[PDB]
C-alpha cells in the first residue's frame, strides 16, 4: 500500500504529461519504466502496480498500431523486390528477431489489462508476419521470365528452405516461454485447448512443402527423365544382346551409352538436392518416390516390352542398379518395388538355371500352386499371375 | 540427512511395469493391426494410450531417473574407489 | 552397423530422459529454498531447454522418417500420422490399408515396429505433456520462487527493521 | 560375496525377462528354493501366456549337470560385458550392496507372506494366485504349463484342486462374467459360496447349464470339501425348493439325482437327504 500510493503521484506527474509524447520517444519511455520496475523488483522491492497503469488504453492502442505499421512498413521494405527473395528469410527472422526483442522488454510486463495488447502483438504482428510472409514466399517469382525447369527445381527447393528456416523459428517461437504463457492465458482466458499460436501456419508450411512443391519437384523430374529416357527406351538390342565376353571386367561393368546422360543429369539434380537444406523426411520422399517411378519405368516400358538375352537382363539390372545408386538411401533402408524388380530379374533368371527345370513344365504351371518355387528365390512380393506371365513369356522365346 | 534410494527395487518394479505395457501394447496393436475392421481403430487400441499412457510416461522416466541415480551412485562409488586406491 | 531410426529413436529418447532428469533436479534445485549466503543456473536451464527443441525437432523429425521407412518398406501398409490439435488428445496412426496375404515373418516384424514406432509416438505425446508441464512447473515455480524470495526479503528486511528500532520503550 | 551378485544378477534378468540369462543363473545359486522364489514373485506377473515351461523344465530334467562349467565368475564378467547397463548393478559398492540384497529379500519374503518354496507346485500355485490379482478372468493361464506336464511331476491334489476348484471357479466365472479372484473364491465361506452358486439356477431355460454346473462345480466342490451333507443340510430343503415352479421340481429332482450318485458310501448323508427330501415334499 505504501509503495503503491507513493508511486500514485509520480503516475500523476507522468500520465500527467506522458499522455501527449512521440511515440519513438514513448518506446525509451515505457523502457525505462520497466527498467525502474526490474529495479523496484529487485533493488527496493514492490510487487504492485507500476507506471504502467498510466497509459491509457487508447495510447497501448495507438502505440500497438504504430508498431503494427512499422512491421508491416520493414516488412514491406524487406519484401518488395524479387533480388532480396535469397536472404529474406534470414532479414525475416532477423526482423522478427528485432521485434521479439524490440517487444522482449514490453513482453516482460505482468499487467493483467495488458496481455490482451500482448495478444494483439502475437496475431496482428507475429501471426500476421508469418501468414504474410508464407503468401509472399508461397506466391513469388525471384526468377527471371526466361527460365528453365532445372531453375524451378531450384526455386522450390529454396522456397522449402526458405520454409524450413522460418519454421525452425516458428517452433523456437512457440517454446518461447514468453508465448507459451500467452497461449497458457488464452486457453484460460476463453474455451479453448490450442496447442500453438498457429496451428495452421505451420501446417500450412508443412503440407506446402510436404505435397505441393514435392509433387511438383517429382512431375518436373519424372518429365524431364522421360525426356531423358526417350532413347534408352527405342534400345532393341536387348533381344540380341551378344556379352562382350571381357574375361577381366564382369558382365557389362558399364551401362548402355544412351542412359548415361540421364544418369549425369539425375546425379546433377540429386546433388543439388541432398546439398540443400531439406527436412530429411521429404528428402526421402522424393528420393524414394524418383526412385518408384524409374522402377515402374523400367519394369513397363523395358522389361515387358522387349526380348532379353542371358546378357541383357545383367545390363538391365546394372543400369537399374546405376540409377537407384544415383538415389542412395540414406543410412538403411529397403524398398517395396526395389524387392519387387529384384523378385523380377531373379525370375528372369530362370531360364538359364539348368537346375530347376522341373517347373518349366505346364502342367505344374497351370496347377497355379508355386509354394516350392517361392522356396527357390525366397520371392515374397508376387502375386501367380505375374508367375504365369513370367513363364510365358519364358515359353514363348522372349527369353533366349 | 543422506537421502537413501536404493533405486533397485524401484527399478524392477518400473521394468515390471514396462514389461507389463509392452506386452500390452503388443497384444494391442496386436488387435489393431490384426483388426479385421480395416476403417475402425479398436477401443483397446486407443485406450492403451487412454489409459496407459501417463502410467507408461510415468513408469518409464521413473526407470530412467532410477537408473541414472544408480548410475550417478556407481560412478561415485567408482570415483571413491579410485581415488582410494 | 545400420543404425536404424528406432535406434535413433531410443538413443535420442534416453538422451532426452537423461535431459529430462537434469532439468527436474535443476527444479528441485531452486525448490529448495537456497540463499546467496542461481543465474548461470538459470542460464544451463535455457540452454538444456534449446537443447530440448533442438532434440524434439530431431525426434519429431526421425520420427516422421521413420514412418516414411516404415510406409516405403511394405506395399500394403497406408499409415498417416495425425498431429492432435488439441493437447489434451493423443496423436493419431490411422493405419489405412493393408493386405492380410503378406508373409508372417514380415508380418510379425511389421508388429514390433508398429509397436515400436507406437510406444514411441505415444511416449512422445506424453514427453511433450510432460516438457510442457515442466516449463508451466518452471514458470509457476519462478513465479512462486520470486514470490517467495519477496516473503524472505520481507521477513529478513522485517527481523531487520523489528531489531533496529520499534519503539521497544513501552 | 558370489551369492548376492548372482542374487542381484537373477533379479535384474528376472525383472527384464531375460530367459536366455536366468537360464545359466538357475543352477548357480546353491539352493533352487531361493531361486524359484525370486523367479516367481520378481518375474513379470504378466510375461506371457507360457514362454515359461523352460523353468518346469529346468524343474523337472535335472539328472546330468554336464552344461559347460564356465566359472561364475566367468559368467558375471561375460554378463556384464554382454549388458553395460547392469554393470552399475552388478559391480557393486560394499555391504550396502548386501543391504540391498536384505532389503530385496524382505520385500520377497513380504509379498511372499512367509511362503517356503520347495518344488514346482507352490511356485506355479503362488503364481497363478498372485497373477490373478490383475487377471480378470483367466484362470486357464497356466493350463498349458500343467496340460503337458510330465509323469509324477504334479500332485493329486494339485490336480485335484483345480478340477475342483480351478475349473469350476473358472466355469462359472465364464457362465456370469464375474471377476471373482481364485483367494476370494476359496476364501469364501461355503454359506455365501453356494448362496452365489444358486443364485439364477432357476432361471436357466434347458438342461444343460441346470446340470453341468453341479457336474463341474458344486458336486466336486462337495466332494473335495466333503461337503455333500452340509450342502444339503443348508440347500437341499424345502425353503430353497418352495415346490412352487416346474422348474424348481426340475432342479430339485436334478440335484437329488447328483448328489445321490454324489452320496454312495455316506449312510448317514443318504438318511440326511432322504429325510430331507421326504420333508421338503411333505412341506410343499
Known sequence: QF?????????????????????????VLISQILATDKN???????????????????????????????????????????????????????????????????????????????????????????????????????????????????????????VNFVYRKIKSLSSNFIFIQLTDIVNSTESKKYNSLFQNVENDYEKAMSTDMQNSIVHRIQKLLKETLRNYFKISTWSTLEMSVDENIGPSSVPSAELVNSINVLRRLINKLDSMDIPLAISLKVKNELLNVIVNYFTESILKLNKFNQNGLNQFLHDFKSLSSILSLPSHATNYKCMSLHELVKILKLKYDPNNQQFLNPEYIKTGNFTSLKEAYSIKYLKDTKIQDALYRIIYGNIL | AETSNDPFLSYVLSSKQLTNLNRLRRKAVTKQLGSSDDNKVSEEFLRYQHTYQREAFEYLQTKHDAHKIMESQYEQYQSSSKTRR | MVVTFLQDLEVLQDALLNNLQKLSAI???????????????????????????????????????????????????????????????????????????????????????????????????????????????????????????????????????????????? | MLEEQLYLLACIFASRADTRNIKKLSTRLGSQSK?????????????????????????????????????????????????????????????????????????????????????????????????????????????????????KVLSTKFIGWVEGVLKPLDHLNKRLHLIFKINEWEKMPDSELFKIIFDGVEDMQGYIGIADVIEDELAPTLSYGKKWETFITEFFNKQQFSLKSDTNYQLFIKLYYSLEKGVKDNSEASRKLQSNVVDILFHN
Not at chain 1, 61 to 89: C, L
Not at chain 3, 144 to 150: G, P, S, T
Open chain 1, 40 to 162: 523496484l523488483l529487485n533493488s527496493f522491492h514492490y510487487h504492485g502496480l507500476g507506471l504502467v497503469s498510466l497509459i491509457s488504453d487508447e495510447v497501448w492502442e495507438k502505440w500497438i498500431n504504430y508498431e503494427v505499421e512499422m512491421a508491416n512498413r520493414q516488412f514491406i521494405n524487406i519484401t518488395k523486390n524479387p533480388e532480396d527473395f535469397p536472404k529474406s528469410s534470414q532479414n525475416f527472422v532477423k526482423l522478427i528477431n528485432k521485434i521479439y526483442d524490440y517487444l522482449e522488454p514490453f513482453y516482460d510486463l505482468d499487467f493483467d489489462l495488458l496481455v490482451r495488447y500482448k495478444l494483439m502483438t502475437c496475431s496482428l504482428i507475429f501471426m500476421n508476419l508469418t501468414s504474410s510472409y508464407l503468401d509472399y514466399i508461397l506466391t513469388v517469382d525471384s526468377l527471371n521470365e526466361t527460365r528453365t525447369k532445372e531453375q524451378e527445381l531450384y526455386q522450390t527447393m529454396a522456397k522449402l528452405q526458405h
Open chain 3, 27 to 170: 527444479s528441485r534445485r531452486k525448490e529448495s529454498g537456497e540463499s546467496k549466503h542461481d543465474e548461470e543456473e538459470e542460464i544451463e536451464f535455457e540452454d538444456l531447454v534449446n537443447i530440448i527443441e533442438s532434440k524434439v525437432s530431431d525426434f519429431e523429425s526421425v520420427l516422421k522418417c521413420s514412418i516414411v521407412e516404415m510406409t516405403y518398406k511394405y506395399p500394403e501398409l497406408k499409415l498417416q500420422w495425425e498431429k492432435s490439435p488439441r493437447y489434451d488428445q493423443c496423436d493419431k496412426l490411422h493405419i489405412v490399408k493393408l493386405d492380410k496375404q503378406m508373409n508372417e515373418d514380415i508380418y510379425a516384424q511389421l508388429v514390433e515396429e508398429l509397436d515400436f514406432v507406437l510406444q514411441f509416438v505415444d511416449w512422445f505425446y506424453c514427453y511433450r505433456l510432460k516438457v510442457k508441464e515442466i516449463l508451466r512447473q518452471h514458470h509457476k515455480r519462478d513465479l512462486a520462487w520470486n514470490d517467495e524470495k519477496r516473503d524472505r526479503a520481507i521477513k529478513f528486511h522485517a527481523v531487520d527493521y523489528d531489531k533496529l528500532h520499534q519503539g521497544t520503550s513501552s
Open chain 1, 3 to 27: 509503495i503503491n500510493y507513493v508511486l500514485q503521484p509520480i503516475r500523476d506527474k507522468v500520465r500527467s504529461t506522458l499522455f501527449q509524447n512521440d511515440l519513438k520517444t514513448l518506446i
Open chain 4, 35 to 151: 531361486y524359484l522364489e525370486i523367479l516367481c514373485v520378481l518375474w513379470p506377473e504378466l510375461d506371457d501366456p507360457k514362454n515359461l515351461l523352460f523353468l518346469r523344465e529346468l524343474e523337472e530334467e535335472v539328472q546330468s549337470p554336464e552344461g559347460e562349467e564356465t566359472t561364475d565368475e566367468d559368467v558375471i564378467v561375460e554378463l556384464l560385458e554382454s549388458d553395460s547397463s547392469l554393470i552399475p548393478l552388478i559391480e557393486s559398492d560394499t555391504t550396502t550392496r548386501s543391504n540391498r540384497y536384505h532389503e530385496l529379500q524382505e520385500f520377497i519374503s513380504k509379498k511372499l507372506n512367509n511362503k517356503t518354496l520347495e518344488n514346482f507346485e507352490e511356485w506355479l500355485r503362488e503364481r497363478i494366485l498372485i497373477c490373478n490379482e490383475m487377471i480378470p478372468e483367466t484362470p486357464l493361464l497356466y493350463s498349458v504349463l500343467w496340460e503337458t506336464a510330465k509323469s
